[PDB]
């Protein structure tokens, strides 16, 4: 019941010659895969771990100054110098002051002045990095039977958690009663962690671009420094003020925690307290169903009386789930489940819980099925005591096609050119489309890198207008397509 | 001389007494006794249930 109830559920149906299928697993989503003669499975990516992170900078978000020193030279005598001006733990600046007989110089001009203060860091943000080889994705595979997933502290015989790492990217999960499932994942084509930084603030962490992290205008330490005292852009966290030309002072600019939070908008928040846990991103895996068989296919129909212990509840994916107990003989038996019309003359829906069986008499089993969009009837059992359950589905086929197309477009928006692997069975059209998407995505990412969603909307409108007011028909169509796609991406971006 | 306070802005805060309430699908909106108090910051959202 975990994959049911997740709005981002995905239905992957079919396998190629070879009983494998390509699926992309996201952290907030679920993939339910159905084959012609295979048990339905639920796939969730529940944990991404980065191990042994290495720091590369320690930007300072709050500093202070303690030893302010000033040096002055009378006018015409050149710039002054301070000993601290060669100290790297000191911030210095050169300016001018008005000098004369009253001041104490004796030459009536503008004398150079330099003030230096010791820069000390009170709070910093660590930009750790991880090697792409140190990632570890945890994926749970559940056989999606009506069988209850069990309660904790006693048994975990239902969920199967397989850890995937770049070194061991091919792993096998032995699902009790269903054979084994082999996942051939490619964790090296996920986030590209070589260009990512694990940015950890006081108690919060984000996953951020590495060039963005290296371009931050705060003082930083190289990350190999244990004593600090060698901050680089100390000038960015201090302000030197010479009101008029009388006295030169310096002060710190205050805690940059809130400004940094504002700067982190659009960065996904990760966890870095007890290890580096990333509940964000996807994983492309190839799923092998060769050694995966339905459980209890050598069973006879129950020929008993079922009772619905939990009324039919509709999910947000178009299917229905019903909870039925069994009061009959021959406990391990197949459940006679059909979804027909009123006259029981046609089979209208398909139960996506393929081969429901009753392991124990009083143990309830909850079947999931996909009824048709019209009126339909769920028939459970055989002639003596048969249950006929009416149900009505509100949608329509045209609406379903629209929603499926929208979900595909959204998948392309997030997994640009990796969406082609979401339910691919190999194919040649899929390969050609993936190559074309890779080229177009390279061009689009080059032309739209670092641009906000409002800028994307503006550029899309401009390009659409240029295309509409174009001489060439082919150029007009291409520009209109580019503009409309840009508008869709700017409306769907920053999520 | 003799200044008068016009407004007092908050630059640093702390959040405590965090509490959540939920009303599952189609049954309306959740209720927190904290929403009656104006020193609590509140937000409404939907979760999958």
């Amino acid at each position: 019941m975990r994959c049911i109830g997740i709005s981002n559920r995905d239905f992957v149906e079919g396998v190629s010659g070879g009983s494998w299928v390509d699926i992309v697993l996201e952290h907030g989503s679920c993939v339910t895969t159905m084959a012609k003669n295979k048990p339905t499975l639920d796939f969730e990516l529940i944990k991404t771990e980065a191990k042994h992170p290495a720091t590369l900078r320690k930007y300072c978000i709050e500093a202070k100054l303690t030893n302010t020193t000033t040096a002055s030279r009378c006018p015409t005598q050149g710039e002054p110098s301070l000993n601290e001006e060669q100290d790297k733990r000191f911030v210095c600046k050169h300016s001018m002051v008005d000098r004369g007989w009253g001041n104490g110089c004796g030459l009536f001009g503008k004398g150079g002045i330099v003030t230096c203060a010791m820069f000390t860091c009170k709070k910093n943000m660590e930009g750790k990095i991880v090697q792409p080889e140190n990632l570890e994705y945890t994926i749970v595979i559940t056989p999606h039977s009506g069988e209850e997933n069990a309660v904790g502290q006693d048994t975990g015989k239902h969920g199967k958690e397989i850890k995937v790492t770049p070194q061991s990217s091919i792993t096998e999960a032995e699902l009790t009663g269903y054979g084994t499932v082999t996942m051939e994942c490619s964790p090296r084509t996920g986030l590209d962690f070589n260009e990512m930084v694990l940015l950890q603030m006081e108690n919060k962490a984000w996953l951020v671009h590495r060039q963005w992290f290296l371009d931050l205008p705060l003082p930083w330490l190289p990350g190999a420094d244990t004593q600090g005292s060698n901050w680089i852009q100390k000038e960015t966290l201090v302000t030197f003020k010479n009101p008029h030309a009388k006295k030169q002072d310096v002060v710190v600019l205050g805690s940059q925690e809130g400004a940094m939070h504002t700067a982190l908008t659009g960065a996904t928040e990760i966890q870095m307290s007890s290890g580096n846990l990333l509940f964000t991103g996807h994983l492309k895996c190839r799923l092998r169903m060769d050694k995966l068989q339905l459980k209890g296919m050598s069973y006879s129909m129950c020929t008993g009386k079922f009772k619905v212990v939990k009324e039919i509840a509709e999910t947000q994916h178009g299917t229905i789930v019903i909870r039925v107990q069994y009061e009959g003989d021959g406990s391990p038996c197949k459940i006679p489940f059909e979804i027909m019309d009123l006259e029981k003359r046609h089979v209208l829906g398909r139960l996506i819980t393929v081969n429901p069986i009753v392991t124990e008499k009083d143990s309830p089993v909850n079947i999931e099925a996909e009824p048709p969009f019209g009126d339909s009837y769920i028939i459970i059992g055989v002639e003596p005591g048969q249950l006929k359950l009416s149900w009505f589905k509100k949608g329509s086929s045209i609406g379903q096609m629209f929603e499926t197309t929208m979900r595909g477009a959204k998948r392309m928006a997030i997994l640009g050119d990796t969406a082609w692997d979401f339910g691919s069975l190999g194919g040649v059209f899929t390969s050609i489309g993936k190559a074309l998407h890779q080229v177009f995505g390279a061009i689009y990412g080059a032309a739209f890198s670092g641009v906000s969603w409002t800028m994307k909307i503006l550029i899309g409108v401009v390009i659409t207008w240029i295309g509409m007011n174009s001489r060439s028909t082919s150029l007009s169509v291409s520009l209109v397509l580019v503009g409309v796609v840009t508008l869709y991406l700017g409306v769907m971006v920053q999520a | 001389k003799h200044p008068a306070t016009l407004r007092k802005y908050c630059i640093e805060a702390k959040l405590t007494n965090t509490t959540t309430a939920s009303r599952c699908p189609t049954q309306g909106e959740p209720s927190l006794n904290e929403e009656q108090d104006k020193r609590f910051v509140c937000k409404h959202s939907m979760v999958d249930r």
Partner: antibody, heavy 119, light 110 residues
Framework: QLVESGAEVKKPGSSVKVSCKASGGTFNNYAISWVRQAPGQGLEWMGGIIPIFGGANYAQKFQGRVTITADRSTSTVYMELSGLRSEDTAVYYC??????????????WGRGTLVTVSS | SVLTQPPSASGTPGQRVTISCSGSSSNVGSNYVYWYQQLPGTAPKLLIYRNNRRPSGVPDRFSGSKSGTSASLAISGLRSEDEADYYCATWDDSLSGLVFGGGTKLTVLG
């Protein structure tokens, strides 16, 4: 991993709040229900709540008389009983259960707070 | 209504004893049945969860039975330890709440 509040002796017509402090794992992963056992009487279910979700449900006998809430910051669950009376005297328990709507297996319990309605 | 349960139970050490809890179509026979042992001056302990599945804590001698509209708890071997109040708790769909039984005080002779 579940610790309840200390003993409380109250007076008729008052209101009593009971504290049950769970751990982080039990707060974000399990539900917590309030069962009160009257002196020399059987167990009774008052209500429960999914602390992470916070929507509380109560027995039909306790509508408008019991309030159950969670403090996600301190990871605590509270039960507040209004209109305390002679029959409200009992021991109160907080138990940890899964947040599924079918399983009520209390594999963890506190120690009970004796809400003694007397002098 | 509530799960009717036998107020009085009696047994002798070394003897197998079971407790009967009868509910309605919405109390029992439509929801899992949980059995709890509550000794005097102590909080109830979960004896069998789901439909008569033993938690690791309870020894194998403990077990329970579930039927169409009633449940039962089986004791393999008997002792003075089984002298306590017994409760059968099950979610009621109509009552919309976890409704225990009336409570069975099991008395062990000796």
């Amino acid at each position: 991993q579940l610790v309840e509040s200390g003993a409380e002796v109250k007076k008729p017509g008052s209101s009593v709040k009971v504290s049950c402090k769970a751990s982080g794992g039990t707060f974000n992963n399990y539900a917590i229900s309030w069962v009160r056992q009257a002196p020399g009487q059987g167990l009774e279910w008052m209500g429960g709540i999914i602390p992470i979700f916070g929507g509380a449900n109560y027995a039909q006998k306790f509508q408008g008389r019991v309030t159950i809430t969670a403090d996600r910051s301190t990871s605590t669950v509270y039960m507040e009983l209004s209109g305390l009376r002679s029959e409200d005297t009992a021991v109160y328990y907080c138990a940890r259960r899964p947040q599924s709507i079918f399983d009520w297996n209390f594999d963890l319990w506190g120690r009970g707070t004796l809400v003694t309605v007397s002098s | 209504s509530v799960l009717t349960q036998p107020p009085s139970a009696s047994g002798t050490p070394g003897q197998r004893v079971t407790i009967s809890c009868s509910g309605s179509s919405s109390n029992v026979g439509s929801n899992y049945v949980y059995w709890y042992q509550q000794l005097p001056g102590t909080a109830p302990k979960l004896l069998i969860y789901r439909n008569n599945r033993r938690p690791s804590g309870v020894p194998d001698r403990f077990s329970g039975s579930k039927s169409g509209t009633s449940a039962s708890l089986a004791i393999s071997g008997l002792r003075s330890e089984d002298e306590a109040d017994y409760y059968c708790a099950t979610w009621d769909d109509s009552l919309s709440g976890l409704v225990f039984g009336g409570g069975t005080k099991l008395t062990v002779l000796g």
